[PDB]
Amino acid sequence: GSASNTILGDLNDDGVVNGRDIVMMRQYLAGKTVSGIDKNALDINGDGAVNGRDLMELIKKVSNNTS
Ligand SMILES: [Ca+2]
Ligand SMILES: [Ca+2]
DSSP, rough: OOSSOOOOSSSSSSSSHHEEEEEHHHHHTOOOOOOOOOTOOOOOOOOSSSSHHHHHHHHHHHHHHOO
């Protein structure tokens, strides 16, 4: 996580909402154990669960800023 604790939208913890986060999203969503993920950063919509809603939020972030 960056300067907050966790950075929602930045799953690979690089400080930016990018297409690499999509990868990490999809890993955990598929049920993979993602080494080097910020597992808390996946809950982008802030519901407490890592779901496709967050994926859609991620797509929102990444489409806007950097893919
Ligand atoms: Ca990122
Ligand atoms: Ca969520």
